[PDB]
């Protein structure tokens, strides 16, 4: 093995400088295979042959050799192999598909490498898999981020990754997940409502965003959430048969501008359901419509 | 005996009238008595007197009543109920017409209960529409003109929504110019009858049973697509369910309520009226939003004088789409405003409907019509898997009287005979059937165990007794309450810690307590002794699944032992919400007993979970050419991309034989076999004149220089039926094999698997059975053909009884041992080739691949290119032996005769070395996956080319299989007539879809739809829901084309003809006709088969010492005397076996065998003393059947059990029972009539053998005329044998 070490080192020193398509490369690789005939349990020479085959760039030969080497060594030393073959996934010219499958093989043995995976997907504009794995790890509640990100941090990441890539997640349940997260996010309810509304907007389902903002105003608890959500709704009405439609735009904008004191009063009371003085002012908000004042009394 | 008289009596109606004036229900208000009906129908009252002489000029109420009650009792008993009317249908239509008015009789004209029986007969007709004569009766009531029963606006909107129907509608009118409202008048009469019940000193049970039967009839109507197609809108306009909700019969605090729940689940099912397809969720949303929008528009246009209505109209759909919003926008309306809205603007009720003048009813109709309701998938996903006390005792759903289910009541259980709406409906019905069938056995287990507990008072509970099936829990508290998944409104996981005491261990009970493993089902039961629910005060019973046993260190791996068990989180969440809203107790702390049960008999909950996952799977991943076949609807079109040319190989032993097998197929023998005459193997090509097959002979590529390396061969001279079955299995599609008794199913199936392994080396075979013995026989036949044991494996949860182990650990052992041998072989190969460092090439598995390329292949290429240059030279060809580079390896070669010969020998030895290296590379997995379980996963997922298992194991393993990336292309299954529906459909989805379409290409199902069906613990589920009918039998019932195995080769033909009449052209093989082992008669009896009469025995015949324990001491004594006389004749006792059609006969027979013969040195014991159904597939030389029953014919009248118990013999059968009892039943007569063709007295020869079956015996044949003479004979004979 040390004799084999000298042999392999001398071979790799001797073929250093020749072209990749020389006989010498295959000869040194065959000598390395003859060495692994004896030393299947050797992580050192295995990583040596693996880095040398990386310098060969033989995707399929290095692939078969990696698949054989990881299985030939006990688990406790494949780590020194992972940081090797992982770097190979970062090497260009091989399929992204093989990288994805090898990542699925890796993250099933040590899942704490999750964020690295996410980065590569962000590094490929494959948002339909990035957001998918992010929502996966967003419900695997035991997961502990490697970069120190909060569950809320990856949550905002997945919110943005759904909203900006509303076409890319086709096949997934964005609506239910964002809703149940609004049942898990207590600090950004208005933000989540507005984000899901914009995600429904960017898919041409304006009525779905309008119903979203409706259930948001009917679901908000604090004044910030209803303020931000109704501000989004007013901007959406302002932005979204030509003359009749422009006048309907003006009419709904007038609607919501007449409405903002109404709803802001509503959430002022959502904050303090027994604040009688704000009830005084909100009763005065409804002068001219005495039915409203009787209802508010 | 009356119809066989020379002058048969002329048919007379006076006798019928006399019968009606009595024992017949007609004249009465009460329904006809069942015992009398049993006496009458079993007397063939319909098939012989009623139906054969029935006429319109003679028909009345009494005749139709007798016929309807007889048809009902015939369906209740599971006998043919249509053949008599199909034999003579000239009068079958007219009665049917007079049937409808009989159902359309007004109240007090004809008996109510008689009209309930009429409704039941009409339900059976609507459910038996597969018959043509019944089809001509159901068509005119189930056709398009049924829309002529609708309101004018109803049909107008119907033609406006789908305009293209209107044209055909006019055609109907045109067709008229040169029945439709039967269901509608029935529904109006049903609403009236219901209204005639007092909601709140009691009403008649007739009305309740009528409503329940009508709900069952409507359920069967709307569970079947073709009849519901146009009855759906008819029942919708009929507003029947809306009344059924706010009826008086409904609020009566049960059967009608559950059947109305079934009707509500069915009438809103997501199935398309004309398209017949399942509607998506977006379609449902669009339909609900459309109708709601229309309603809003109507309110805007018709309700402008009512502010609230206008506000509701102005609001979006989703705001007013709920029930709260519906109740919040109406009660402001006057009755005229509600009528204007509902009848004119929305048209939900015709202005001419008698109920269109009632305010509250109209409001209720409006509320029912408009509400966002959750889908069926949501309803299923919100269901528990385990029941509580509300279902455990209720015989309305889960049965008490269900063991004694007479057929007389309706039951709220969905039943499917030929198909379903779609796939999801079948899945829900099968899962519900499995749950409700397991429910009765769970009730039995709990009742017995908590009876054994002897629970008594103390506000405590003290146990006078103990149960090995139930231990009292000492501590019980839930520790794990997970948050819901998004969308889900229930817990994601509920576990609880439960600690109980060993108490008196008794070196067994304590060990059993430890037998808990993960997923095993236990139950926490809370009971309150008042002194079975009344007995021990059992209140709550909730089940759980132990996840792991916790050791004394807090890790989920004295006498106090604790477990973490996961309970039903959905039922738990329901109970929690109900506690929070209704202040109810938390039963999660009130449990005080924990009970577990058997591992084999506790598979229900896991199968429910798998059926639920199948109910949640995104797509119908089944091949679309099989969804319609499994649906029972559409042309099967799944029979055999037909591969024209396929390799049959070792199928035919001779070229001539292949031609002989198929009568319609021409022989074009292309002889490339190197022999003068055609020889195996052979290739057969099928055309696409055209009845010709092109046969190309082939030579198997040499496997090397070793003669023992030659591949094995199949040897069975398969007949044309077996050849056609293997051919259908060889081409893609559905193959249905109906194989008779001993017709060679296992051989043809193993040949099919071998041809699959051979013609397509990239495809695998999935083998699914019902039993482990079937897999044993399949593997015993597989090893007998050239199929690599490295490519076959069998999974199971047992005894290894073959020579080889196809278990996963057997695969691990084969892989490891062959890996060690292979490395040594490689090392030997190197050393001999003079390669330096020969240890380094064989040291590493990967290296061996480099040695193959550099040292083996490159020596072979130099050899071939040297031998070609030498052959060109004209030098002696021995040159192959001179140049061959592997001479020292193959020392443990070339003939020099011809160029091609030595080239083939060299190529073969090279392919041998290539196979050695390929097996090394294939076993590299065991050097890459250390753990044996990882190696099992690697074998099933990558290497295995035939993966075998059973139905229960496949159900348990579907989840983990689809998880572990399992793949398989073609599947074969035996016992296809004994596998429950879900158990045979399950093995199709043990893997995910590829590109969105199924990878399944061949579905081979072999069985006998004439043999015994699957097992049901509860005899009520077969009576009511017909759940024992298998999927293969249902397919064949629809008209699935099947190859009929018609060559029996294991039993005597004179014995075979006793049951071969149930099959198509099932004959006898050459050996059964020619082998003297079949022409040998039985010693000690003149005849090789005889029916033995058994009269009363001291005033006793069939007796029942216990409840339901039917035995016959006399026939048992006679069978024991026969077996003892045979064992005195020297017959091998273990070659003779005793079976019985009731377990009581087997128990009494065991007692008598252990009392009278037991300690004898001359007398042996039978092979098996067991049951007819407990002898399925088994065989002996001599069979002795006990027909103990004498008063009731019993379930031995079934054709399936008759065939089974008639084909359990190979050489000799002795059947002992009341002959007149069995002769009186027509269904078994075809067999029984044969048994009457010989004497009914025991014919023995106490002095004898080499006699022939037909030839005259050369000794005096003695006759025993009764069991007493048999006993005297056996006593005296044994006495004379003992002094010798």
TrEMBL record, chain A:
Subcellular location: Nucleus
Ranges of residues in domain Pre-mRNA-splicing factor SYF1 central HAT repeats: 115-297
Domain Pre-mRNA-splicing factor Syf1-like N-terminal HAT-repeats: 1-111
UniProt similarity note: Belongs to the crooked-neck family.
The protein's name in its UniProt record: Uncharacterized protein
Organism name: Chlamydomonas reinhardtii (Chlamydomonas smithii)
TrEMBL record, chain B:
InterPro entries according to UniProt: Aquarius_b-barrel, Aquarius_insert, Aquarius_N, DNA2/NAM7-like, DNA2/NAM7-like_C, DNA2/NAM7_AAA_11, P-loop_NTPase, SF1_C_Upf1
UniProt domain RNA helicase aquarius N-terminal: residue ranges: 1-253, 254-373
Residue span(s) of domain DNA2/NAM7 helicase helicase: 722-1018
Record-annotated DNA2/NAM7 helicase-like C-terminal domain positions: 1027-1219
Gene3D superfamilies for this protein: P-loop containing nucleotide triphosphate hydrolases (3.40.50.300)
RNA helicase aquarius beta-barrel domain location: 459-597
Signal peptide feature range: none
Domain RNA helicase aquarius insertion: residue ranges: 643-710
GO cellular component: catalytic step 2 spliceosome
A Pfam family hit: Aquarius_N_3rd
GO molecular function annotation: helicase activity; mRNA binding
UniProt name for this protein: Intron-binding protein aquarius
Taxonomic source organism: Chlamydomonas reinhardtii (Chlamydomonas smithii)
